[PDB]
């Protein structure tokens, strides 16, 4: 049975969970995992980025997402406007051994949650975790503005389907719980919404759609385009399944500004808007049902505190246009490992490492805050110059710039390729046209250098 | 009814090759005589399939009636050539949950396929051998060399049946779909040209009880290929739907003898796989055990005048990746495609024959090069043939030689993989050792 004990207790077996508890668990820590689904279970986010072999390499799982066989991306296309889109190119930067996935995400967090397990932490599915248990910490703790005190949280709750119910102690915490957010929204309260992405979803699969740049070398690659106009962007994400993902995205009120089997209808509705999806769609046969969900984009007061982490959703949520999601759920998850490690065997106090994965979370974050919402205001706008575009017929020269960032790099250190100089001006371009310690992230020695 | 004196075309053996070659002339109107010397249904060994069999299969509309059969559901197939790892080939990955193959019967696939081709409109008759063919001489401007041959034009064949009556048929055009024994490739234009490397020999029977592989895992129970631990050969073992699995074992010629042999190799190759051994851990034998050559070949020429060879006819190549019947129906159907461009004057005979012949002989070729790596990899126990940078078994390897060892990269029907990939799969494995088709119903033919 779940035991009363551990050392570190992982909320929510997501990629930021298993990711979490695999890079512990490699490290010897007695480390338990909740999940409150069983494995394979549907989920939406299928669009990865390069950093995603760095990030599995660390846990010695790329090969074995490798050796699945999902779709590959080799990069993305994203047409803001009326003008011929902008591209990036994974196999361009990384070489031609560095393209990512698109990915039926039922099975990839499969490959994630079993991997924890066969890393030796305990796994358990169908268990929710009801209720966590803070122990005062009256002793100072002082922030960077990032790291919160609501005592140190010390025991969980947590209930079986099949009628078992129990607690379990454990000395740190690792918050994976996803949009829920039982920290971050029941004990903390500290989700702040961006008014200007809190935006709605609707998307389907379909078959038979007839691929982008078809005998290109860029063929049935991933494509977004934002509507002409200027209300959302639609996707297109191919997958393994035989069927190609596509979607819409529309903040709140316009979305029911458009109400003027109603979800097929505005999916064909929206459809309209986006005249390179509305073309690809042209053969298309519906095999899915029509599905629609929350897609608010927020942040957090604070990412982590006395003996815990809050990684990926749980944390904070960005406007899915770049594909960020997966990539900032295990980067987090990384930085939850090696914080959690230092602090342990006193690489550095509590207070020193929490405060450390905040920023690494917040950081992240903020990268792609500013890159997608410089997309989403030339998305907003059609004729006007954003991004430096007046002069030319695409967006080729603004993703040079954005490469960085796009692809992932710019907070974790393991995503090696790019420099920081690249890096900083991914950051200035951007802002623009919107106008210590170092981890040893060493297998059996993960922690913090000063 | 009896077997008419005149024909459009007559196809030579009833096998996959012939009733596939016969329906898809048929279904284009064609006075289509079908003669095949064994009566259906009748046991034939070639049990696994790949999932090209659907494109094949759905250009003749033969794709539901197999569907309804009820063979065993294929994904897949598992790979182990060495002690390392298993390399997987997954089917449902590429072509989705409707793209799967089968594990098939022969005695019951063979009937369909047969009676599919009375059904098309062909003219089909059992216990019927063509013991002989006259080709005249077609002295006109037709020369050879290409993969094309001229021994004259086959223009009648001798036939006899087992009653005792006899005859002779003309006809417009023949499709050798005879088998190994192959009348035109041993008989007329003597090309066949064997390959001393793969000169195998091959033994095998069916047993019940056999435990699954892979058990609970989303590829269970799929076909089963690993090489022999000391590198003398490989084994096989492919489920059926009739609840037995199948099992074999191949060999050299020279090392198959390093009767009562027959059950008693069966068993050393067996011991010599311990994959293998382990699901037959409990199982007991319900068929007798069989052996049969299973030597590789080509031919100098797979084409001449107003002739089309096809299947074991032409070529054959060592079924460790389960080409035997994807060639067959892949070769047939650009029997039928060179017929009637040349019928309908899409083109000279002469340039569709050399276009038949190519893609008989370009369909081979993959096969050829990636079956001669992983055989090589399969001696070379200890050596890295297969084995690149990685942290365990061959299935980076099986990555890149996805698109062929699927049946993709000369048939045009098979459309799921891109023109780059298939060009990887080729160097991947050699670095270790014009005209279209208008593949529409009631317009088949070729273009410039
Ligand atoms: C419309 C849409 C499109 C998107 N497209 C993309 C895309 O293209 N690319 C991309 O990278 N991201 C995309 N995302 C985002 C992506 O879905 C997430 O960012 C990603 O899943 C990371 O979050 P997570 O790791 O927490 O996963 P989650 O699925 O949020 O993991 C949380 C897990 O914890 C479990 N859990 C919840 N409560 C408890 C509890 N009390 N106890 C135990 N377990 C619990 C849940 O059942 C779940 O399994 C998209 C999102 C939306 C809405
Ligand atoms: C041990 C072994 C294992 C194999 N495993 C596989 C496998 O897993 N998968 C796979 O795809 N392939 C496999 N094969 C190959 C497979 O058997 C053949 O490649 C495939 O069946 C193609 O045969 P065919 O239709 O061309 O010839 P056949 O199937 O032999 O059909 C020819 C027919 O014509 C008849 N015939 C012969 N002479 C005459 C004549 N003169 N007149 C009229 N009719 C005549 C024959 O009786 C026969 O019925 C295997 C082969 C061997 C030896
Ligand atoms: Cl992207």
């Known amino acids: 049975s779940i035991p009363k004990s551990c050392e570190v207790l992982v909320a929510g077996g997501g990629p930021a969970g298993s990711y979490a508890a695999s890079a512990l668990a490699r490290e010897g820590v007695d480390v338990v995992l909740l999940e409150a689904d069983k494995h394979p279970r549907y989920h939406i986010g299928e669009s990865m980025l390069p950093s995603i072999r760095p990030l599995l390499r660390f846990i010695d799982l790329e090969e074995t997402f490798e050796k699945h066989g999902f779709q590959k991306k ?10 011929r ?6 196999v361009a930067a990384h070489g031609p051994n560095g393209y990512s996935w698109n990915v039926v995400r039922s099975e990839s967090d499969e490959l994630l949650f079993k991997h924890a397990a066969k890393s030796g932490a305990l796994t358990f599915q169908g268990v929710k975790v009801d209720s966590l248990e803070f122990e005062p910490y009256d002793s100072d703790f002082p922030s960077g503005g990032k790291v919160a005190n609501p005592g140190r949280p010390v025991a969980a709750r947590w209930s079986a389907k099949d009628g078992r119910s129990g607690t379990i102690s454990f000395q740190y915490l690792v918050d994976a719980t996803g949009r829920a957010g039982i920290t971050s929204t029941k004990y903390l309260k500290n989700r702040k919404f961006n008014e200007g992405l809190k935006n709605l979803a609707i998307w389907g699969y379909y078959k038979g759609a007839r691929p982008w ?3 290109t070398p860029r063929e049935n690659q991933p494509y977004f385009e934002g509507m002409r106009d200027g209300a959302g962007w639609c996707w297109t994400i191919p997958l393994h399944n035989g069927t190609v993902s596509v979607g819409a995205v529309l903040r709140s009120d316009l979305f029911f500004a458009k109400k003027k089997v109603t979800n097929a209808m505005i999916m064909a509705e929206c459809m309209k808007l986006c005249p ?18 929350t897609d608010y984009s927020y942040s957090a007061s604070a990412y982590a505190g006395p003996y815990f982490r809050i990684v990926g959703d749980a944390g904070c949520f960005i406007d899915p246009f770049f594909s960020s999601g997966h990539h900032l759920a295990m980067a987090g998850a990384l930085a939850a490992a090696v914080s959690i490690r230092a602090s342990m065997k006193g690489d550095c106090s509590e207070y020193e490492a929490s405060n450390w994965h905040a920023r ?11 890159v997608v919402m410089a997309a989403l205001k030339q998305i907003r706008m059609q004729e006007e110059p954003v991004l430096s575009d007046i002069d030319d017929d695409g967006f080729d020269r603004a993703f040079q710039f954005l490469k960085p ?4 790099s710019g907070s974790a250190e393991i995503v090696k390729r790019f420099t920081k100089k690249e890096v900083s001006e991914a950051i200035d371009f951007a802002v623009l046209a919107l106008d210590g310690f170092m981890p040893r992230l060493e297998h059996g020695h993960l922690g913090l250098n000063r």
């Open 74 to 83: 080799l990069g993305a296309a994203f047409k803001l406007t009326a003008k």
């Open 85 to 90: 889109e902008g591209y990036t190119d994974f």
């Open 213 to 215: 740049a078809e005998g």
């Open 276 to 293: 390179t999806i509305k073309e690809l769609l042209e053969p298309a046969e519906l095999v899915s049902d029509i599905k629609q969900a």
């Open 360 to 370: 690494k979370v917040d950081e992240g974050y903020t990268l792609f805050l500013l």
């Open 405 to 408: 960032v796009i692809q992932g």
